[PDB]
Design a protein around this nucleic acid. Structure first.
Lengths: 129, 318, 147
DNA sequence: CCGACAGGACTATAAAGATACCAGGCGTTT
DNA sequence: AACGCCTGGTATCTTTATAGTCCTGTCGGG
């Protein structure tokens, strides 16, 4: 048994919100890496998240491209897990599947987050770090 | 002569040869600020060695430091400031050997950046444009009246170099101040959206509208004056070309025209950047508010992503 | 309101709490000056990240330094200047993620102290005194007009 | 009070080692 | 070949120790 990385979780929870979003349902499920990246930076703390790419990052473009390449890497790993399918001829675009909802296991019930987390670790669903 | 007579490689060699450097630790920087403040409260703009030592003692108290060798520590700090070109020391035989101290332009510029609460003002800009318009108009009338090298140097070159150029630099500094203000507002809007995005919508719209109106008011003011300032610079250029020229006046007028173009261009660019952000924040708010309709998971999942690092957790896989 | 609203002890407490400091060794100071020179030669007063990296490379050459990690060292230097409030960075979605840089009033004041050959001109003073005399005279006429 | 003598504290620098951060190499997968 | 992962190297920073430098204190002598 193995565990996913925190960057994988960030991309996972964002892919989940993307699946739900009726605003983008008109795309018929086809999303682009750039749109995913734009949504992620819109919600999470950009400069604090950059700490995981490099301990010295302060918003430099080289570091921003390095983040984008790490996202490209993790997304490819999620594709192997069956959580996302790339288009047959274009690798810059892909389609989501319902399997992404496992990233919402900590909030699907409107209750105390601590108790939920305890329940999950007891069930073997998730580990801390 | 370009204000910076040296090319980048020449400057780098010159800097390397002269070994110029700045090192401002918290305690020394606090002492500098304390000196700057004490100097501003005085009638003669001069400080004695004992007064500087008393100021250092207060900083050391404020840092809760040992009272041992404070007189030595203060002398070291004073010598370091003098050695770093922050303080000028005057040793007069007439003063029975007592040294008089004054802050250097550098020591002042550094202390003012931290202590002076600098915020952008249109009234100020309007006044500055009015003065420069009158100075350029007088210089253009003097250039059109014609004259000798003494007339051109005193009534055209001196006002352009020692008055117009300085006012343009002040305008540019004010613009750079406004640039910092915009970055500060972006950080506040992100904080408001992270605390309570539902109650923060009205506050964010107020901050966006107040900043936008300011940027537009600024640009309207620059554009109204910019045409008159350029026309006067052109009148001076035409009069200079007609009176056999002066390479010194032509170069100075060209430099001022280049600065004026930069000053006018900056406002439009700042507005475009602010518009991109404003559209993005409005789109984000509309997406957050209106697209969840049972409105059940928007809050439920967004708060989880926003605060993940307070309880990072990971899934298990075969 | 005194330009400096804070007493010496209050300022010391405030400075201590905000942890303010400035570190510009000869290389960093030279780079700042190079950026200041390059900005003055431009029509838009803006510098891209690639142009700043090219400027850093010239400084490094001028200091006879190894060409190893120069893109990294340049990024660390650029981030240090932004972190030290010497440069303002603009990240626009419209610019496809390319950041635009401008020097802050502080970064300009420091660079100008070293690069600008400031010598005392009597004409300059006479001119400045002329402008202030006219500004004070207008302000006095406005104050006497009442309102 | 001076002057001598040592001792200690403080400060600064050197030396060494670690830690970060990237690159390069290698291995796998598209 | 490119991307992803690991290993080690290079840069940077910190820590640790040492040695300096000056100060302070004491005592004795003048």
């Amino acid at each position: 048994r193995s565990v996913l990385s925190e960057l994988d979780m960030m991309v996972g929870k964002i892919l989940c919100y993307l699946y739900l979003s009726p605003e983008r349902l008109a795309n018929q499920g086809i999303f682009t890496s750039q749109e995913l990246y734009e949504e992620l930076i819109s919600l999470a703390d950009e400069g604090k998240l950059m700490k995981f790419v490099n301990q010295r990052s302060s918003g430099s473009d080289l570091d921003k491209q390095k983040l984008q390449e790490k996202v490209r890497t993790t997304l490819n790993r999620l594709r192997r897990l069956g959580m996302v399918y790339f288009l047959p001829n274009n690798n810059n675009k892909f389609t989501i599947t319902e399997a992404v909802f496992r990233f919402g296991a900590d909030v699907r019930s409107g209750d105390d987050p601590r108790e939920i987390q305890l329940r999950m670790i007891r069930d073997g669903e998730a580990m801390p770090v | 002569m370009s204000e910076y007579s040296q090319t980048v490689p020449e400057l780098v060699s010159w800097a390397r040869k002269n070994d110029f450097s700045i090192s401002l630790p918290v305690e020394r920087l606090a002492f500098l600020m304390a000196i700057a403040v004490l100097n501003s409260e005085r009638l003669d703009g001069e400080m004695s060695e004992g007064e500087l030592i008393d100021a250092f003692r207060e900083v050391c108290k404020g840092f809760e430091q040992t009272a041992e060798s404070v007189a030595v520590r203060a002398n070291n700090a004073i010598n370091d400031m003098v050695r770093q070109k922050l303080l000028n020391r005057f040793t007069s035989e007439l003063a029975d050997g007592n040294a008089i101290y004054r802050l250097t332009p550098l020591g002042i510029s550094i202390s003012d950046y931290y202590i002076r609460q600098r915020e952008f003002s249109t009234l100020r800009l309007s006044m500055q444009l009015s003065i420069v318009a009158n100075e350029l108009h007088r210089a253009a009338e003097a250039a059109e009246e014609g004259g000798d090298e003494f007339h051109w140097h005193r009534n055209v070159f001196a006002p352009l170099k020692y008055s117009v150029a300085e006012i343009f630099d002040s305008i540019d500094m004010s613009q750079r101040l406004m640039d910092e203000q915009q970055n500060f507002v972006k950080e506040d809007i992100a904080a408001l959206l992270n605390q309570d995005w539902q109650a923060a919508i009205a506050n964010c719209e107020q901050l966006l509208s107040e900043t936008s109106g300011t940027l537009r008011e600024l640009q309207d003011t620059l554009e109204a004056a910019g045409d008159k300032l350029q026309a006067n610079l052109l009148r001076i250029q035409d009069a200079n070309m007609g009176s056999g020229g002066s390479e010194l006046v032509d170069k100075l007028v060209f430099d001022l025209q280049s600065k004026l173009d930069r000053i006018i261009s900056w406002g439009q660019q700042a507005i475009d950047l602010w518009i991109g952000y404003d559209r993005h924040v409005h789109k984000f708010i509309r997406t957050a508010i209106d697209m969840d309709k049972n409105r059940i998971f928007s809050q439920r999942l967004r708060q989880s992503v926003q605060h993940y690092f307070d309880n990072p957790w990971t899934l298990t896989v075969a």
